[PDB]
Every structure is written in structure tokens, then in C-alpha cells.
Coordinates of C-alpha atoms and ligand atoms in Angstrom, one line a residue:
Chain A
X1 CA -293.6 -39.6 10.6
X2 CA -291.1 -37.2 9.3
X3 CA -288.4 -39.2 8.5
X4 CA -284.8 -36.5 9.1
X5 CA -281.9 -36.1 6.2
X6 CA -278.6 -34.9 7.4
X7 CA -275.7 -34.1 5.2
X8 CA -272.7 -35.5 5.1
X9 CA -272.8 -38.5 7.3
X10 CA -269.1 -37.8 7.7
X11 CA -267.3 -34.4 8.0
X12 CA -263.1 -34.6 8.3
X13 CA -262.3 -30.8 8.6
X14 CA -259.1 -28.7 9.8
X15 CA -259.0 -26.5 12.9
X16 CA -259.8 -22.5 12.5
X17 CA -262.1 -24.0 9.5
X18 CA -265.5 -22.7 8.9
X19 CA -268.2 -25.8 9.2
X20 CA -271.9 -26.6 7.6
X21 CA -273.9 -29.3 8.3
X22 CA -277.6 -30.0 6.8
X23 CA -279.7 -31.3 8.0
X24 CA -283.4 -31.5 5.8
X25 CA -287.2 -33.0 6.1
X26 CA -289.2 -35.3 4.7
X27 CA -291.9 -32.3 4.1
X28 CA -292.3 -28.7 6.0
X29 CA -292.2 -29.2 10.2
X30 CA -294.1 -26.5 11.6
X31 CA -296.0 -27.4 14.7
X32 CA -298.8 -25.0 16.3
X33 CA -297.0 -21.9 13.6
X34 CA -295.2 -21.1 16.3
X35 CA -291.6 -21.8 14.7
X36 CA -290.7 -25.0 13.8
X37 CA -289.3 -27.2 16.7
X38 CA -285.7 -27.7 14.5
X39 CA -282.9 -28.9 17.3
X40 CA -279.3 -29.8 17.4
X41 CA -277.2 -32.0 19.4
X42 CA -273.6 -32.6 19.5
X43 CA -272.7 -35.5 21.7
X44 CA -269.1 -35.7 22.2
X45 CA -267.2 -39.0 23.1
X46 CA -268.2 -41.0 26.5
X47 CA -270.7 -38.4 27.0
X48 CA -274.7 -37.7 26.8
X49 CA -275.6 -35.6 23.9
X50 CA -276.4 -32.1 24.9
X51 CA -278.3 -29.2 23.0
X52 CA -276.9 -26.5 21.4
X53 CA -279.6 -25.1 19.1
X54 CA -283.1 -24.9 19.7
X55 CA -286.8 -23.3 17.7
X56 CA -284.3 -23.5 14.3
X57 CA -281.5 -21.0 15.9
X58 CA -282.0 -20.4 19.7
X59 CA -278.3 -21.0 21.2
X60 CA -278.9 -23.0 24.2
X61 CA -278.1 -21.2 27.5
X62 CA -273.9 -21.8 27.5
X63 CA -273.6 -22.4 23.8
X64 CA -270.5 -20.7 22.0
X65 CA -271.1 -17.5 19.6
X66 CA -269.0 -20.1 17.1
X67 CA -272.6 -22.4 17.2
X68 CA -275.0 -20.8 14.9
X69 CA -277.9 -23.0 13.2
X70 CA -280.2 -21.5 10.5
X71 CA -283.1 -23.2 7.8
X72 CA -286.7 -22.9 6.9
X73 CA -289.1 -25.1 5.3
X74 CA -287.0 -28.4 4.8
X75 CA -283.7 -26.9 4.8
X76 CA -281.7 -26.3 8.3
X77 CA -278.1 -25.7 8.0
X78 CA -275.6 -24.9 11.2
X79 CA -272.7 -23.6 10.4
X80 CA -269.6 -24.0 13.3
X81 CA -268.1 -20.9 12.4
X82 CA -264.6 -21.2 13.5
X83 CA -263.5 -25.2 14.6
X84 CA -262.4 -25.7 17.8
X85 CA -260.9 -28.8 19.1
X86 CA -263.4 -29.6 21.4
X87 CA -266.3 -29.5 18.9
X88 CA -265.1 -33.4 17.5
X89 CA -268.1 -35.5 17.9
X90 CA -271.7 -36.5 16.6
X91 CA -274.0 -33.9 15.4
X92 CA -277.9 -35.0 15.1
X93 CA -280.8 -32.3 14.3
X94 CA -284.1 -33.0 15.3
X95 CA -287.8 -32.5 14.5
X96 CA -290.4 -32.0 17.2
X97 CA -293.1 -30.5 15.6
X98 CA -294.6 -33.7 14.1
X99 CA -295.1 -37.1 15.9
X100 CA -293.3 -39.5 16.4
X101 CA -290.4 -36.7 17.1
X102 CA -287.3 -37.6 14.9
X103 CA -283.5 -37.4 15.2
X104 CA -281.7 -37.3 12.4
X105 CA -278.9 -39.8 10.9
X106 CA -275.6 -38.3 12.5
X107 CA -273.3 -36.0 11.0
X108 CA -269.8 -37.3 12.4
X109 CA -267.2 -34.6 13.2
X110 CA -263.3 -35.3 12.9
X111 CA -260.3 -33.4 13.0
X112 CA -257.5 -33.2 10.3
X113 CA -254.4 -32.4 12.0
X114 CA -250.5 -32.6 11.1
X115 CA -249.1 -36.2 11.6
X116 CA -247.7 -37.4 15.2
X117 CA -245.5 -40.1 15.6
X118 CA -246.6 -42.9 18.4
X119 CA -245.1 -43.6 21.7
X120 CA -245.0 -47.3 22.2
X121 CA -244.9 -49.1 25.5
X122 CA -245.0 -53.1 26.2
X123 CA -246.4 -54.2 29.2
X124 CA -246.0 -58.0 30.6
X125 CA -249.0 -60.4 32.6
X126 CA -248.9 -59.9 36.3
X127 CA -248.8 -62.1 38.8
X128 CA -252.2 -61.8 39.5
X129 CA -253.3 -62.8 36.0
X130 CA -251.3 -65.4 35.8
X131 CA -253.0 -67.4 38.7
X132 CA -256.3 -67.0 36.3
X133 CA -255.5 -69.7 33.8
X134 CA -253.8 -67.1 31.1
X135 CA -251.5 -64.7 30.7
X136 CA -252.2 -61.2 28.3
X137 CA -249.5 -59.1 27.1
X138 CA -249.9 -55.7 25.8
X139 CA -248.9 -53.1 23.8
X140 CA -249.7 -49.6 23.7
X141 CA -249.3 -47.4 21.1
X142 CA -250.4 -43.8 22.4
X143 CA -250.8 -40.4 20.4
X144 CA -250.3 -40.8 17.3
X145 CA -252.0 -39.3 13.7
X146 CA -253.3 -40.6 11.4
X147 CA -255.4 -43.5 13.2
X148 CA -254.0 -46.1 10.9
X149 CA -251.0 -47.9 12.5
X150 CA -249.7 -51.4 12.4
X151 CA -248.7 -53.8 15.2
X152 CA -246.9 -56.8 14.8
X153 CA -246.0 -59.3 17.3
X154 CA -243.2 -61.8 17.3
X155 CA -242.7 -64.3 19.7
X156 CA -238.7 -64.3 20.2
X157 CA -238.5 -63.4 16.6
X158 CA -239.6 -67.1 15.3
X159 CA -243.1 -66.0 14.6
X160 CA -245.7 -63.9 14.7
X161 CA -249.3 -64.5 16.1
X162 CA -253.1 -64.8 15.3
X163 CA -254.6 -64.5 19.0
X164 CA -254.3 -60.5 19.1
X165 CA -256.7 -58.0 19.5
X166 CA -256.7 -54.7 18.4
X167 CA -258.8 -51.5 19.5
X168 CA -258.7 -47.6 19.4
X169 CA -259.5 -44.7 21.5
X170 CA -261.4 -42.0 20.8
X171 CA -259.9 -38.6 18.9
X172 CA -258.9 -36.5 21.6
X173 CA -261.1 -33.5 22.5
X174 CA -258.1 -31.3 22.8
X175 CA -255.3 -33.3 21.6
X176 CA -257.0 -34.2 18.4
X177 CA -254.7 -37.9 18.3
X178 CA -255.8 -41.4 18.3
X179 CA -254.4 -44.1 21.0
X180 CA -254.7 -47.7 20.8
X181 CA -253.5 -51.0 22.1
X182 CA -253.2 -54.7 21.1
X183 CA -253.4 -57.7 23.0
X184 CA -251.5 -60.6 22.3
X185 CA -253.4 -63.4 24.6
X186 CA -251.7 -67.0 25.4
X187 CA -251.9 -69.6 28.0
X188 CA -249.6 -69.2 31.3
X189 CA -247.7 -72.2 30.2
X190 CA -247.4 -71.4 26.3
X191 CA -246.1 -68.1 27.4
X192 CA -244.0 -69.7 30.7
X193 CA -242.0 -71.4 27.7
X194 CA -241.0 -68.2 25.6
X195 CA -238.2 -65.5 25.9
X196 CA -238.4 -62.4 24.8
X197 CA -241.7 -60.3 23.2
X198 CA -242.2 -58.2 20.6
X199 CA -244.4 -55.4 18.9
X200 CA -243.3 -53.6 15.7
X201 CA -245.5 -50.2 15.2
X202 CA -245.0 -49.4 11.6
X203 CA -246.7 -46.1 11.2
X204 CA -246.3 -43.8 8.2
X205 CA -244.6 -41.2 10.4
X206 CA -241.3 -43.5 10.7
X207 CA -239.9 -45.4 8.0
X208 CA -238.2 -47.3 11.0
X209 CA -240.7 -49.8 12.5
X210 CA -241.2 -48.8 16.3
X211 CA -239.7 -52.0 18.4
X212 CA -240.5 -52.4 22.0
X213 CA -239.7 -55.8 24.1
X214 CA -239.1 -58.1 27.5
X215 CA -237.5 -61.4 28.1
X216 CA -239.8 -62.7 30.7
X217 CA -236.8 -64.6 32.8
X218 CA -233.5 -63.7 34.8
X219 CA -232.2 -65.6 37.1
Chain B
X1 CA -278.0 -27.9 39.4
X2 CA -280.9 -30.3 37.5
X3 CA -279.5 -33.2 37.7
X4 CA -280.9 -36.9 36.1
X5 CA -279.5 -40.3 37.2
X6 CA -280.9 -43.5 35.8
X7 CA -281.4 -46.6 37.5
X8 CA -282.1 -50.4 36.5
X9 CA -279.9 -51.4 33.4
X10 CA -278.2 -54.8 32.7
X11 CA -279.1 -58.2 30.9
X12 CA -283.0 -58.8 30.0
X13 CA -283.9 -62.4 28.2
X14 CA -285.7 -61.9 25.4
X15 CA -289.3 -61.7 26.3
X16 CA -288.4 -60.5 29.7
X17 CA -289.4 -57.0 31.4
X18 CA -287.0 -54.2 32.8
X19 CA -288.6 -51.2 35.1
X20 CA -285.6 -48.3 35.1
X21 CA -286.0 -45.3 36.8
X22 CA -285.0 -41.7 36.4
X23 CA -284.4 -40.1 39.9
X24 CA -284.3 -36.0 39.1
X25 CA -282.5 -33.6 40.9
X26 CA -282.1 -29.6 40.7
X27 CA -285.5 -28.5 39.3
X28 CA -289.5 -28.7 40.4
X29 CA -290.2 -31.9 38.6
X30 CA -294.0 -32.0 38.5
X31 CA -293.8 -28.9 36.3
X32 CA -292.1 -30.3 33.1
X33 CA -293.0 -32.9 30.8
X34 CA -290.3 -35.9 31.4
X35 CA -288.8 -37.9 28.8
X36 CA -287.1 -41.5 27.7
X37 CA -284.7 -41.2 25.1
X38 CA -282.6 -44.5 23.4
X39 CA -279.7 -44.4 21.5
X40 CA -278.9 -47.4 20.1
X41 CA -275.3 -49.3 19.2
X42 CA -275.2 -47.9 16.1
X43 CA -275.3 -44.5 18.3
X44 CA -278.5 -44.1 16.8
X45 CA -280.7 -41.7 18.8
X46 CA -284.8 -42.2 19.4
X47 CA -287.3 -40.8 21.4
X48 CA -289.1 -43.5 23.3
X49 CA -291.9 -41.6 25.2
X50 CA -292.9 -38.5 27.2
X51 CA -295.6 -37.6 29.9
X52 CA -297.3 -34.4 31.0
X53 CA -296.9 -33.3 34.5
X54 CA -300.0 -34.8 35.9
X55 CA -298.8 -38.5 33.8
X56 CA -302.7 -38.2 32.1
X57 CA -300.9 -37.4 28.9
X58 CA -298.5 -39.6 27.0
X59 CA -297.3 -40.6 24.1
X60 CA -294.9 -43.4 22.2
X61 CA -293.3 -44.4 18.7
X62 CA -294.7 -47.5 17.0
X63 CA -291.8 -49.1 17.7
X64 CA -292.4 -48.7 21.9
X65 CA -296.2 -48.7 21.8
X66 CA -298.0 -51.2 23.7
X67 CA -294.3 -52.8 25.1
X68 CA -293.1 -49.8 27.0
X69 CA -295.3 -47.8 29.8
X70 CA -293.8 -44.5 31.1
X71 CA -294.9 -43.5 35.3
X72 CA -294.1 -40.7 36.9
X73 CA -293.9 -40.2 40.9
X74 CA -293.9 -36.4 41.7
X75 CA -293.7 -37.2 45.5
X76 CA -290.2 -39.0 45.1
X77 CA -289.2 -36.7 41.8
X78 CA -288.7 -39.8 40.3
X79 CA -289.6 -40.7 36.2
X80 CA -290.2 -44.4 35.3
X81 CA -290.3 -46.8 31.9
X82 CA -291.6 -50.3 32.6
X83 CA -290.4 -52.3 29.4
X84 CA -292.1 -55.6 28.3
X85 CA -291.8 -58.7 25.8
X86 CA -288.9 -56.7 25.0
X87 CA -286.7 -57.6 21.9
X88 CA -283.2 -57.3 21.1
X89 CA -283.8 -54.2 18.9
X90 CA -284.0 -52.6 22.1
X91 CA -280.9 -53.2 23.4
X92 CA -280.0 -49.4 24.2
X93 CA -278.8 -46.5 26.3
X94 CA -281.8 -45.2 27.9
X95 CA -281.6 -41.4 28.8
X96 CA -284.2 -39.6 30.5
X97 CA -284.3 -36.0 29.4
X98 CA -285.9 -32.8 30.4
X99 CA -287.5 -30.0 28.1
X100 CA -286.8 -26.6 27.9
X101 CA -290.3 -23.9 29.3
X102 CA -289.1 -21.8 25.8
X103 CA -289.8 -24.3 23.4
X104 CA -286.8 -27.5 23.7
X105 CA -287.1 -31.0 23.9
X106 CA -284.0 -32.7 25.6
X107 CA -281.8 -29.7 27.2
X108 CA -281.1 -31.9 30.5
X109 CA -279.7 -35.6 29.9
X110 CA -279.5 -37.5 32.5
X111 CA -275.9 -40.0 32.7
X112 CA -277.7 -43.0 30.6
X113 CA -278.4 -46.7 31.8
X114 CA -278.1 -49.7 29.2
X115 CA -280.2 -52.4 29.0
X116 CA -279.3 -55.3 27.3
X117 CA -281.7 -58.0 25.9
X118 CA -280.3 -61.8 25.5
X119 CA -277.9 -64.1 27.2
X120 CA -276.0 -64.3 31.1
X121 CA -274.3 -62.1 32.9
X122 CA -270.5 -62.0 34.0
X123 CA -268.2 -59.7 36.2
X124 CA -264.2 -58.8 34.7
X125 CA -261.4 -59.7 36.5
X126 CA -259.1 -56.1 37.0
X127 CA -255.0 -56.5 37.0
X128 CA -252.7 -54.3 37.0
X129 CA -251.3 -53.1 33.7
X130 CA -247.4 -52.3 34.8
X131 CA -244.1 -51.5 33.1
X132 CA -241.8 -54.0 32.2
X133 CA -239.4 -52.7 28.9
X134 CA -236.3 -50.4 30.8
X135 CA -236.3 -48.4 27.9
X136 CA -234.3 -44.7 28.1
X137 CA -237.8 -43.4 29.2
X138 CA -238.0 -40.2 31.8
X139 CA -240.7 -37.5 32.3
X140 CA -243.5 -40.1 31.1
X141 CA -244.7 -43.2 32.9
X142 CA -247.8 -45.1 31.6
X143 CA -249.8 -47.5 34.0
X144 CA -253.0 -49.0 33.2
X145 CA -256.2 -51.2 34.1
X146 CA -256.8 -54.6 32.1
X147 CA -261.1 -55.1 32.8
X148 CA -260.7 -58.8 31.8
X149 CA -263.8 -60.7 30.2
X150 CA -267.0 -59.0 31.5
X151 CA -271.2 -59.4 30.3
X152 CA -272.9 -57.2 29.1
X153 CA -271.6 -52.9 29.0
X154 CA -270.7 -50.7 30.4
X155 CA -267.7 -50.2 32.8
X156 CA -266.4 -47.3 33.6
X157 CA -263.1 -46.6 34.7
X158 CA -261.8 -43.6 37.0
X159 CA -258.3 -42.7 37.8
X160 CA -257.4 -41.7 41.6
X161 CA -261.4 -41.0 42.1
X162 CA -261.6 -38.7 38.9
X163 CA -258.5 -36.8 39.9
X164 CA -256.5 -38.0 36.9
X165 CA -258.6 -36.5 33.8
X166 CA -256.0 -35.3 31.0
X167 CA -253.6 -38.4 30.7
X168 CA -256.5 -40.5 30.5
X169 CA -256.5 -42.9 27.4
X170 CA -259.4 -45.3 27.6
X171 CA -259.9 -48.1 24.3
X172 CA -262.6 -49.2 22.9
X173 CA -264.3 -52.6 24.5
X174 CA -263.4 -55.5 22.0
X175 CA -265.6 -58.3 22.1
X176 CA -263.7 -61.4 22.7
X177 CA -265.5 -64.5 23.0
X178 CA -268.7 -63.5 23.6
X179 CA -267.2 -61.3 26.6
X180 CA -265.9 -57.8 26.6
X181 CA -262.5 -56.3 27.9
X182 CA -260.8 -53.2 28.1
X183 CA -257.7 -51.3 29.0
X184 CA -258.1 -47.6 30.7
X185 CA -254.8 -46.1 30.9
X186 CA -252.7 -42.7 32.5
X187 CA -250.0 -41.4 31.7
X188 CA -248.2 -39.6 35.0
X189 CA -245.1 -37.6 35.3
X190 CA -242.3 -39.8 36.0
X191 CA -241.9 -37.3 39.3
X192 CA -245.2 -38.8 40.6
X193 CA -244.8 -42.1 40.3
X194 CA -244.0 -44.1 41.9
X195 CA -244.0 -41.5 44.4
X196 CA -247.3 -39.9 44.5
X197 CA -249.6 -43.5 44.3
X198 CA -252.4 -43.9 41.4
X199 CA -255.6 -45.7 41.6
X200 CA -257.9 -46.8 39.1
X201 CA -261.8 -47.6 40.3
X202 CA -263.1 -50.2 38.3
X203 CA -267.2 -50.7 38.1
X204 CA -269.4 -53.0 36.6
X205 CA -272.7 -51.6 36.6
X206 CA -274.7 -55.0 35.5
X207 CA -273.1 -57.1 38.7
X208 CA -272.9 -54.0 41.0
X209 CA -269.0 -54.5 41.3
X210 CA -266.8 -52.0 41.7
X211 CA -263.6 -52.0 43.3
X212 CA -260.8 -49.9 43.4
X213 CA -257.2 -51.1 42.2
X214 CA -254.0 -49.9 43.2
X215 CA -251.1 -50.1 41.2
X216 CA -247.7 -50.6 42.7
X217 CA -244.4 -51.5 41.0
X218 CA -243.8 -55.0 40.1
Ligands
LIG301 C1 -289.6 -21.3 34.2 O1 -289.9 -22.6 34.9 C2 -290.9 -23.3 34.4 O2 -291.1 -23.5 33.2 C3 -291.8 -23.9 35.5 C4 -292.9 -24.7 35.0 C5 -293.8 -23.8 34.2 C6 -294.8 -24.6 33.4 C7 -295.7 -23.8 32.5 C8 -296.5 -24.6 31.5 C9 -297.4 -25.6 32.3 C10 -297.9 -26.7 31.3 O3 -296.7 -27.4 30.7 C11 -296.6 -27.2 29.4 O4 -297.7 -27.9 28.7 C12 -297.6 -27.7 27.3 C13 -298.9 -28.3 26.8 O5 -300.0 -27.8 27.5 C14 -296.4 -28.5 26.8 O6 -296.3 -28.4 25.4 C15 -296.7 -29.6 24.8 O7 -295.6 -30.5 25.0 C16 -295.9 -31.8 24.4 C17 -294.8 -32.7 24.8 O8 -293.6 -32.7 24.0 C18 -296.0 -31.6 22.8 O9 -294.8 -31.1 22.3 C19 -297.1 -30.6 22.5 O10 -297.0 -30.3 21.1 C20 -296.8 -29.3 23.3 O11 -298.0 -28.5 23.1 C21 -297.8 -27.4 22.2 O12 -297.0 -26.4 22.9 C22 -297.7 -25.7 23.9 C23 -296.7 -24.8 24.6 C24 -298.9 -25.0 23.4 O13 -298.5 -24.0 22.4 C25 -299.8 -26.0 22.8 O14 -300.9 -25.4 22.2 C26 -299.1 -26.8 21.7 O15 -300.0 -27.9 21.3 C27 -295.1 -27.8 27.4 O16 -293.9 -28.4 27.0 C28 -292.9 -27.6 26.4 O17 -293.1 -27.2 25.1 C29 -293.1 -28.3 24.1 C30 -293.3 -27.6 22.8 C31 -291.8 -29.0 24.2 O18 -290.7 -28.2 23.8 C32 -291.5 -29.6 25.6 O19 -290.3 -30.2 25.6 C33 -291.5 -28.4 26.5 O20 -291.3 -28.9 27.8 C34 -295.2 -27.8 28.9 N1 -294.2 -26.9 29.5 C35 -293.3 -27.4 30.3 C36 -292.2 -26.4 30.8 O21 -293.2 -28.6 30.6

């Protein structure tokens, strides 16, 4: 078993930067002489991995002249020679010289980028959930940078709640910001006895926290 | 074009067995050694096992040995992975792969199929994620998908059959009690909508729903 190093499990780098990763061995791979069987992988979000070196620094067929990978012995470097937005994702290297074949630990690749404000938007339970015991409210925060963001929610002001649930999207492959939502969940009744809704976004783009909101009756 | 789409996935007890299946596409199967590839929730990638195209030679990890047994069917270019006394640590995203006749191990990945080992299965309930707030919007209108309270992954979540790619924003599945939801959401030029009308298809591998959703003004 050769057990696969890669360096650093975490890699926050600017666009038009220049980009190593290492990746290193438990001992010397080669196989049959014949090179060393020294891959790499890049999977990017909500897809399969797919190879982009191959035999230590073949560019897989399709491959960008930015990919290059290099190494011998222990030592395997690739260096991404010119960022590109759509290269944010998972790197892994791996050994097939020497069974079991190993993967690496994951290099993770993210994108530092100038700050972007969020757009927020509320939405209110349908109908249709409504029938299904509970009713869900959410709010959507959408492109914004940094990740980190804040949501509060105040029902008509009085209080805020514990029932919410908060979740990201993935750094966008061209867009290079974040998204995410929160979901404030309550009973059809508990929430057929309230007025109005709030979310309060405070992100460190705006000093002014982001209010969005709906009174859930006219008559 | 090769292609590589997986087949079985979904909940296995503990203990159980799971046969998935790799139905290739493209290329002369019985000419390349196949492959079974995991990654596992930590996004953790292993390879699982591989076979020689007469499926006399094969190999396995320690960790698969003796559990898993790899097939191959040449007349129905079609790889297999029976799975036994399985534990949770293989709960994964099984990929079947393909190598590379110059000297590569996984250059064609098939889609993936996820097995999951341990307790019941449950479809989501899809409604309709709607404006409400008449804020001074214009240009931008955001509709959405809720996937309400579904056992075990995936789901996967189109937009007018794959048409709608760029305004796409899909979170992250949040476990809520012991059940997962979701919320896929596009954002269309105020032009379109409510004009132009925008679906979102909806499917639950692990129950075999799928359904598409229409979303209309409120
Ligand atoms: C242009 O289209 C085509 O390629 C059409 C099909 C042509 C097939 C020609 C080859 C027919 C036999 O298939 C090859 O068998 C080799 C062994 O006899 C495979 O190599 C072995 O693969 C094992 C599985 O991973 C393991 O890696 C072994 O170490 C490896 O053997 C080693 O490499 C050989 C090439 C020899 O040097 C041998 O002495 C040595 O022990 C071929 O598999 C490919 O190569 C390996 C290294 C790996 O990269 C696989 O993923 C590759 O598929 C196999 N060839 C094919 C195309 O399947």
C-alpha cells in the first residue's frame, strides 16, 4: 500500500495567479520501469472527476496548455499556470503503479475575488404546501462574496426564531460567488396566526442590514 | 462518444447485498479492463476493483475483498459489482471508469450511482418556490423548487429539461430530521417570465420519482 501525500489540503488563490499543488509518496512508485503511473483529477462541483494528467505529465486528450504536472521519485508537483475561473474544484493525484492503487487526500481549489453584495429575495408557503401539515418560508440570499453572511428572521418584529436552516451553494465556475438560502419552518396554523415576515442579511459589503418581507393577509 | 451510466443505487440494510451495473456506451468494451471506483461523503475517492477483458483477472482493496465481486457481460457491454454483508463505511458514489490503451487508469467516468447502507426509504414532496415581496425589482425574477423531506441522495433537479443552465443556483441538501431537502433555483429575465413558462424536473433516483413541476404565478 502506498499510502498518497498531497499538499495543501486547501488552496484560496486569485484569478491570472500561477498554481502548485504536491502531491508525494509513501516510497518511489514505479511500476514495470515504464514511468511511474502518477495521475491527476480535478472534479469540479456536481460532477464526476475527470483526468487531466496521466504517466506523471501526459495532458489528457482536451486538457488546457495552463495544466502542466511534473515529479519524480516521491515528488509530483502540477502547476495551473495561469487560474481560470473554471478550474475551482477538488484536485486528487493518484498512484497506479503499486496495489492497492491510491488516490490522494484532496487538494481543494477556491477563488479569491473582490467582494459582491447579495441580492435577497423572500418567498412565502404555497398553497400546495400548506395542505401538507406545515408551511416553509424562505429566503434567498444569491451572489454574494465572501461566503460568510448572516440571516435573521423576525416574526412581525417580536422575535426571532430557532426552527431555520441554513445551506450554501457551490462557488460558481464562472461567477466565482456563493448563494444560499435559509428556511424558516412552522406549522400552518402557527404561521396562519402571524403578519408580516422578516430576513435581515447582514453582510460585510453593507453596513445597512438587507431587509426583505410579506404580510401574509389582505383582505 | 464512450459513454458510462450506472444502474442500481438506493438504501441497503446493513448486512444486505446491492448488484449495480455499469451499461457502456461509445467504445469496444471487451477490449479494456473496466473499473468500480467510490468516492465517499467525505468526497474521498477509492478504487474498488478492476477486471481484464476476459473477467479471469481481478483484483480488490482489503477493504472490498471477499464482500464485493466485479462481472463483466461483453455480449450486453455491460460491467457489474455484486456487494455483500455490506457496511455503512460503504455508503458511496460508485463510478465505473474506463482506462486509457497509453497507460491511464480512469479517463472515462461514468454519471455515478449511490448506495446507501442503513435505514427506510422516502420520496420529497416538490412545491413551488414563488415571489411574494413587490419589491422595486425589474430585469431579474427568481423562481425556485422546494424537494421537501426525501431518503436517502441524490435528487437532481433540471430547469425547463436542461434548457436553463447559467441562472441555475442549486444549495446544498440539509439534513433535517433524519430526511433531506433542497431548494434548486433560476433566475429569468423579467421579459420571460411570466411570459415564456419555466419548468423544473424533479427526480428521486432511490423511489424512481420524477416529475416535472411547473411554476405559475400565485
Ligand atoms: C486503441 O484502442 C484500444 O486500445 C483497443 C484495445 C487494445 C487492447 C490492447 C491490449 C490488450 C490487453 O489489454 C491490456 O492488458 C494489459 C495487461 O496485459 C493491461 O495492463 C495491466 O492492467 C492492469 C489493470 O490496471 C494492471 O495495471 C497491470 O499492471 C497492467 O499490466 C502492466 O501494463 C501492461 C501494459 C504490460 O506492460 C504488463 O507487463 C504490465 O504488468 C492494459 O491496461 C492498461 O494499462 C494499465 C497500465 C492501466 O493503465 C489500465 O488502466 C490500462 O487500461 C490492457 N489494455 C487495455 C487498453 O485495457
Amino acid at each position: 500500500d502506498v499510502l498518497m501525500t498531497q499538499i495543501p489540503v486547501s488552496l484560496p488563490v486569485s484569478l491570472g495567479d500561477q498554481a502548485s499543488i504536491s502531491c508525494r509518496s509513501s516510497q518511489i512508485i514505479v511500476h514495470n520501469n515504464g514511468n511511474t503511473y502518477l495521475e491527476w483529477y480535478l472534479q469540479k462541483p456536481g460532477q464526476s472527476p475527470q483526468l487531466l494528467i496521466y504517466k506523471v505529465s501526459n495532458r489528457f486528450s482536451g486538457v488546457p496548455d495552463r495544466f502542466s504536472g511534473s515529479g519524480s521519485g516521491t515528488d509530483f508537483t502540477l502547476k495551473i499556470s495561469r487560474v481560470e475561473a473554471e478550474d475551482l474544484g477538488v484536485y486528487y493525484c493518484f498512484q497506479g503503479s503499486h496495489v492497492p492503487f491510491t488516490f490522494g487526500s484532496g487538494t481543494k481549489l477556491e477563488i479569491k475575488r473582490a467582494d459582491a453584495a447579495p441580492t435577497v429575495s423572500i418567498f412565502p408557503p404555497s398553497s400546495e404546501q400548506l395542505t401538507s401539515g406545515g408551511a416553509s418560508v424562505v429566503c434567498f440570499l444569491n451572489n454574494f462574496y465572501p461566503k460568510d453572511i448572516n440571516v435573521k428572521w423576525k416574526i412581525d418584529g417580536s422575535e426571532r426564531q430557532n426552527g431555520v436552516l441554513n445551506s450554501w451553494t457551490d462557488q460558481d465556475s464562472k461567477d466565482s460567488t456563493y448563494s444560499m438560502s435559509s428556511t424558516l419552518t412552522l406549522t400552518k396554523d402557527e404561521y396562519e396566526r402571524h403578519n408580516s415576515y422578516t430576513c435581515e442579511a447582514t453582510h460585510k459589503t453593507s453596513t445597512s442590514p438587507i431587509v426583505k418581507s410579506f404580510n401574509r393577509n389582505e383582505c | 462518444e464512450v459513454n458510462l451510466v450506472e444502474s442500481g443505487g438506493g438504501l441497503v440494510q446493513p448486512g444486505g447485498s446491492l448488484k449495480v451495473s455499469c451499461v457502456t456506451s461509445g467504445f469496444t468494451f471487451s477490449d479494456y479492463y473496466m473499473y468500480w471506483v467510490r468516492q465517499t461523503p467525505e468526497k474521498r475517492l477509492e478504487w474498488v476493483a478492476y477486471i481484464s477483458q476476459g473477467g479471469d483477472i481481478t483484483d480488490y482493496p482489503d477493504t472490498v475483498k471477499g464482500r464485493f465481486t466485479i462481472s463483466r457481460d461483453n455480449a450486453k457491454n455491460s460491467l457489474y459489482l455484486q456487494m455483500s454483508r455490506l457496511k455503512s463505511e460503504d455508503t458511496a458514489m460508485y463510478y465505473c471508469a474506463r482506462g486509457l490503451d497509453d497507460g491511464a487508469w480512469f479517463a472515462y467516468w461514468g454519471q455515478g450511482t449511490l448506495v446507501t447502507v442503513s435505514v427506510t426509504t422516502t420520496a420529497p414532496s416538490v412545491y413551488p418556490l414563488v415571489p411574494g415581496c413587490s419589491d422595486t425589482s425589474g430585469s431579474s425574477v427568481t423562481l425556485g423548487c422546494l424537494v421537501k423531506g426525501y431518503f436517502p441522495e441524490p435528487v437532481t433537479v433540471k430547469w425547463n429539461y436542461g434548457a436553463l443552465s447559467s441562472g441555475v443556483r442549486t444549495v446544498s441538501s440539509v439534513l433535517q430530521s433524519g430526511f433531506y431537502s433542497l431548494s434548486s433555483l433560476v433566475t429569468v429575465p423579467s421579459s420571460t417570465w411570466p411570459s415564456q413558462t419555466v419548468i423544473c424536473n424533479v427526480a428521486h433516483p432511490a423511489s424512481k420519482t420524477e416529475l416535472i413541476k411547473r411554476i405559475e404565478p400565485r
